[PDB]
Structure 1
Amino acid sequence: GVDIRHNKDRKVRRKEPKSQDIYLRLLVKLYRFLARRTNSTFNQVVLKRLFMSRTNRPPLSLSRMIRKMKLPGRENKTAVVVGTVTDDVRVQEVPKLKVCALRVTSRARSRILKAGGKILTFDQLALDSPKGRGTVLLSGPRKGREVYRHFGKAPGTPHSHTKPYVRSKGRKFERARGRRASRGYKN
């Protein structure tokens, strides 16, 4: 007998996409090869994000892509997101962008192209940037989901700003006892 624990032997991590999409799996075949046969860590990161689930691939808005592609030294670099590029109506002017994405919404496509930009697919990124050179890999906000408002210390604990689960919002819905000192206590 060997003195060892086995509860952590199996690592919980995706080796492939749960999706049965045949176009996504053709891109995984592509980047499985590039990640294996090139020393480029960029390929490994993209291969990993192709396995990732829907909530681990948040959409990247147009306004946020412009901000991150406007930092100094990022001129003529292709912005890359393994996800969806959504349009942002709060933007007034779109610059000339070169972007690679899994999906670009219909209105984001017109605005990027109308500014003189180029929209790639990941099979076109490989031919243009086999090792990922001259790229800017970008991610959407992962905690930008309604669930993360409900996580943390339970709402009924001191200095807990977690959001409760209420069927309705209003004066009659979880506001008397425990939420104001006038009714029992507050914390």
Structure 2
Amino acid sequence: GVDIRHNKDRKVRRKEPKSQDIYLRLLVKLYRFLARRTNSTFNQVVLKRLFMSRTNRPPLSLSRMIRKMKLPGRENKTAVVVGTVTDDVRVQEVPKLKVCALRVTSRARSRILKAGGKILTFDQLALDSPKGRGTVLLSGPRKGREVYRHFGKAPGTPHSHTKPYVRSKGRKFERARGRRASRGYKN
């Protein structure tokens, strides 16, 4: 008679990626060695974020990378993004940067190479810094998707700013009874 509930005995976190692509698995094979042979936690964090899904590694924009590099102290420091570094078109000035990512879009690569920077991959980042010294690990907006606007507290409920699932917005699409104080009630 053993009274431990087996509800939360298995940790449902990932061990291997669900993707069947071979380049990502080779990067996983390299960072499995670096995470267990280096004492740095950087390799463990990068190995963990390689396992995650597409929604868990959101795209990072170029101007938001420029802002986090204009944050002080981290001069001559490389940037490590596990997801994708996409171009942000609403920026004019761009310094030279040392960007490390899986995939960078063509406009962003043209902008970085025109500014005079450097775009590295993860194996080149492991050759440059094995433990990961001189790096700043960044990430995109996790809650930035439209899916998280529907999540949380239910609509039609006081103090709940939640987008309802409406097939088409308009004047006569979920506006009358639960939304007007005139016709019924509002929350």
TM-score range (shorter-chain normalised) is over 0.9
Render the CA deviation track for 1:60-98: whole Å, top value 9, x for unaligned.
000000100111111110000001000000010111100
In 1, Cα distance between equivalents of 2:106 and 2:2: 60
Query: CA shift at 1:105, angstroms?
Result: 0.1
Q: Give the match's secondary structure for 2:64.
A: helix
Q: TM-score, normalised by structure 1?
A: 0.99
Write out the 4+ residue segments of structure 1 that deviate beyond 2 Å after TM superposition.
none
Q: Give the match's secondary structure for 2:85.
A: strand
Query: CA shift at 1:126, angstroms?
Result: 0.2
| Matched residues, number | 187
In 2, Cα distance between equivalents of 1:161 and 1:144: 16
Q: Give the match's secondary structure for 1:48.
A: helix
Query: CA shift at 1:22, angstroms?
Result: 0.1
RMSD (Å), alpha carbons: 0.5
Q: Give the match's secondary structure for 1:69.
A: helix
In 2, Cα distance between equivalents of 1:142 and 1:76: 27
Query: CA shift at 1:3, angstroms?
Result: 1.3
Residue matched to 2:186: 186
Query: CA shift at 1:152, angstroms?
Result: 1.1
Q: Give the match's secondary structure for 1:126.
A: helix
Query: CA shift at 1:17, angstroms?
Result: 1.0
Query: CA shift at 1:2, angstroms?
Result: 1.0
Query: CA shift at 1:28, angstroms?
Result: 0.2
Residue matched to 1:164: 164
Q: Give the match's secondary structure for 2:131.
A: coil
Query: Which stretches in structure 1 are left out of the alignment for 5+ residues?
Result: none
Q: Give the match's secondary structure for 2:83.
A: strand
In 1, Cα distance between equivalents of 2:103 and 2:9: 37
Q: How does 1:1-187 map to 2 (within 5 A)?
A: 1-187=1-187
Query: CA shift at 1:16, angstroms?
Result: 1.4
Render the CA deviation track for 1:103-160: whole Å, top value 9, x for unaligned.
1000000000111100000000000010000000000000000000001111111011
Give percent identity, aligned residues only: 100
Render the CA deviation track for 1:147-183: whole Å, top value 9, x for unaligned.
0000111111101110000011000100000101011
Render the CA deviation track for 1:31-66: whole Å, top value 9, x for unaligned.
000000010100000000000000000000000001
Q: Give the match's secondary structure for 2:66.
A: helix
In 2, Cα distance between equivalents of 1:17 and 1:66: 30
Query: Which stretches in structure 2 are left out of the alignment for 5+ residues?
Result: none
